[PDB]
Design a binder for this molecule. Structure first.
Ligand code: ZN
Ligand code: ZN
Lengths: 100, 92
């Protein structure tokens, strides 16, 4: 195929690429990355989950402090696969596609 | 192996990527790209118009338009100054 780079919406810093893109979520409109760049920082405050409850710290761009998503830190057995993966909101990243 | 994405030193807009890279050893301060993104705006002894960034105006490089035989490779390629771009490598 052709790989992607994900850029912060608020300032265009590189957040990650499709090489670490493991999975997606249709309802939360997030993509799940195994691996992120130095520009995704982790607000060290554990907040509870408000959906179908996990513990998860929120992600934001080291550059402009835009809210980028969340990481699952603590999860029940059924959600262990999402644990430690970076969920990036689609409404907060912009894709650049390689190949012109 | 893994590809690169080149980006404007000034506003981080994407310029182009290593998929278009032209391996040259003649020039020592420019990356040669066979094609570039919408963000590389071309504006206004070789004739060569100047490249700059469509978002922020930063002088980015140049394009050799008229060349002699020995420079025919550089012709119509976008030379991005490595002092005016940055790169993100995929897999990081
Ligand atoms: Zn940002
Ligand atoms: Zn720029």
């Amino acid at each position: 195929e052709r790989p992607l780079v994900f850029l912060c919406s608020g300032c265009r810093r590189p957040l990650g690429d499709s090489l670490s893109w493991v999975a997606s979520q249709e309802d939360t409109n997030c993509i799940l990355l195994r691996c992120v760049s130095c520009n995704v920082s982790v607000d060290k405050e554990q907040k509870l989950s408000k959906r179908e409850g996990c513990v998860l710290e929120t992600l934001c761009c080291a550059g402009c402090s835009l809210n980028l998503g969340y990481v699952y830190r603590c999860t029940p057995k059924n959600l262990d696969y999402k644990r430690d993966l970076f969920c990036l909101s689609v409404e907060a990243i912009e894709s650049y596609v390689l190949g012109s």
